[PDB]
């Protein structure tokens, strides 16, 4: 019966430094602009194929696991378990949508470090994934792409989420979803890496819902991107001509709230929150 905390968690920062070192080995930029410095280097074309990473505890330490069906990530856990390593976590760098993550045991669970604070990001965990296929036409335009998913299935998701929102912010309220107000291309659109290429999918049909068959998302591939590891820009090599396909499960979302009504917009940017959605039941403790 110990106290858990996902926001001040140390494991999150542990794998964040791990993923950064991973991108420097496989996906190396050709040009890097940071702190008024122009850096150029080799830019090999290596395909990014995610593999489940199991984070274990070092010598003289242990990993505690909380088994609560509805644990908000902050407070004393009554069902604590001692494990050797965490579950296979698929390091998927993205925004707005959480891909290939872990689902909820019972029902949807919205988590936040401070619901009252509109600046704090809200992490949503679905209890049922929605498949989304993002492919890139074979050898028109090489930087053009698109994604497909079930319209009706995505409708239910929004509905179920809106129910949890009002269940926390009071019943007598109207929940409305609106696209990102602004910001970098990576934040305004659903961005992610697939086949070594950076996708920027337009997410206006997913986040334009009101209380009162499928969806095709137009996407594009860029070479100039705003680094997520740190502050600065980077330019990668030209896209490959081969077919690029990636079918992934939507297991969660990142929302951000700001005309007296409840308006929620797609969040993202800090990949730390992405790791939190998987390490909200774990914590490293030194053996006595």
């Amino acid at each position, epitope marked *: 019966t110990e106290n858990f905390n996902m926001w001040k968690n140390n494991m999150v920062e542990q794998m964040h430094e791990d993923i950064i070192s991973l991108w420097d080995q496989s996906l190396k930029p*050709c*040009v890097k602009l940071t702190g008024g410095s*122009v850096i*150029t*280097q*080799a*830019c*090999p*074309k290596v395909s990014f194929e995610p593999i489940p990473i199991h984070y274990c505890a070092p010598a003289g330490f242990a990993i505690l696991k909380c088994n609560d069906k509805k644990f908000n990530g902050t407070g004393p856990c009554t069902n604590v378990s001692t494990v050797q390593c965490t579950h296979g976590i698929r390091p998927v760098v993205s925004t707005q949508l959480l891909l290939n993550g872990s689902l909820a045991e019972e029902e949807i669970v919205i988590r936040s470090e401070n619901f009252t604070n509109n600046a704090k990001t809200i992490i949503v965990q679905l209890n049922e994934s929605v498949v989304i296929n993002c492919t890139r036409p074979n050898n028109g*335009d*090489i*930087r*053009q792409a698109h994604c497909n998913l079930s319209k009706t299935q995505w409708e239910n998701t929004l509905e179920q989420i809106a129910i949890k929102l009002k269940e926390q912010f009071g019943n007598n309220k109207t929940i409305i979803f609106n696209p990102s107000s602004g910001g970098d*291309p990576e934040i305004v659109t659903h961005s992610f890496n697939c086949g070594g290429e950076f996708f920027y999918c337009n997410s206006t049909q997913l986040f334009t819902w009101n209380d009162t068959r499928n969806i095709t998302l137009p996407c*594009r591939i*860029k*070479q*100039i991107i705003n680094m997520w590891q740190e502050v600065g820009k980077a*330019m*990668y*090599a*030209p896209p490959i001509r081969g077919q690029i396909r990636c079918s992934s499960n939507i297991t969660g979302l990142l929302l951000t709230r700001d005309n007296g009504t409840e308006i929620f917009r797609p969040g993202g940017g800090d990949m730390r929150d992405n790791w939190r959605s998987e390490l909200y039941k774990y914590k490293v403790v030194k053996i006595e």
Partner: antibody, heavy 119, light 106 residues
Framework: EVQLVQSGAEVKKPGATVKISCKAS????????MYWVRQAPGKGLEWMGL????????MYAEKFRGRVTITADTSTDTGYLELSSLRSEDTAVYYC????????????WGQGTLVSVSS | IQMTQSPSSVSASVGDRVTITCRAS??????LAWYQQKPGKAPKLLIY???TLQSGVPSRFSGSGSGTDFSLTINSLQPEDFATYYC????????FGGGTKVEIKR
């Protein structure tokens, strides 16, 4: 069908600012890169910078990195180049290039724009 | 980000085999393009990807190399092959080489 029409030649004073335009046609202007290159009489080709119109992402050569600016108006399908603090050394023919077939090379070229800088 | 092209000048007769090289300070894989320029005329692309030939360009033009060292060669030298050639970086930036002029030997 696919051609790049630049603006007429100009004349500037040592210290003024010049701005060149380049109208594209025959392809999706906002979906491709636009490149700029200048050549001084007697010398060789010199790359200046590039731009991705839809998001306005730019990359400038180290030499002009500080007094150059490349933009792209997707409303009229025209790219612009701006070089300030002009000197007698900036006298040359400036070209705007593109790559409609995406070959990673300058397949199409404008007629050029002679910019004469002198007191 | 720096391209060195040598020699700087070469003289040959009609029907000869000309070969120019191009060096890159940094490994740019196979992203190098070759151009042909004539006094007064705008540059015309010849070879891209450091091997692939342009549609319309004579077959007597061939290129090779990968990484940092490249080279351009011509099977036979025609009267309209005499000009200046440039090698260009094309992985991220597009820095040009110094260029090489092909003159007639007499």
């Amino acid at each position: 069908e696919v051609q790049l029409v630049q603006s007429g030649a100009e004349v500037k004073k040592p210290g003024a600012t010049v701005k060149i335009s380049c109208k594209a046609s025959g392809y999706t202007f906002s979906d491709f890169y636009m490149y700029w290159v200048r050549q001084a009489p007697g010398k060789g080709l010199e790359w200046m910078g590039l731009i991705d119109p839809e998001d306005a992402d730019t990359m400038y050569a180290e030499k002009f990195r500080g007094r150059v600016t490349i933009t792209a108006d997707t409303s009229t399908d025209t790219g612009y180049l701006e070089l300030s603090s002009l000197r007698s050394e900036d006298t040359a023919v400036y070209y705007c290039a593109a790559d409609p077939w995406e070959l990673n090379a300058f397949n199409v070229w404008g007629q050029g724009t002679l910019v004469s800088v002198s007191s | 980000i720096q391209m060195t092209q040598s020699p700087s000048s070469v003289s040959a007769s009609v029907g000869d085999r000309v070969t120019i090289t191009c060096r890159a300070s940094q490994d740019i894989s196979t992203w190098l393009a070759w151009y042909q320029q004539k006094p007064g005329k705008a540059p015309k692309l010849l070879i891209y990807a450091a091997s692939t030939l342009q549609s319309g360009v004579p077959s007597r033009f061939s290129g090779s190399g990968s990484g940092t060292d490249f080279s351009l060669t011509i099977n036979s030298l025609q009267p309209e092959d005499f000009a200046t050639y440039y090698c260009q970086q094309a992985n991220s930036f597009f820095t040009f080489g110094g260029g090489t002029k092909v003159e007639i030997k007499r």
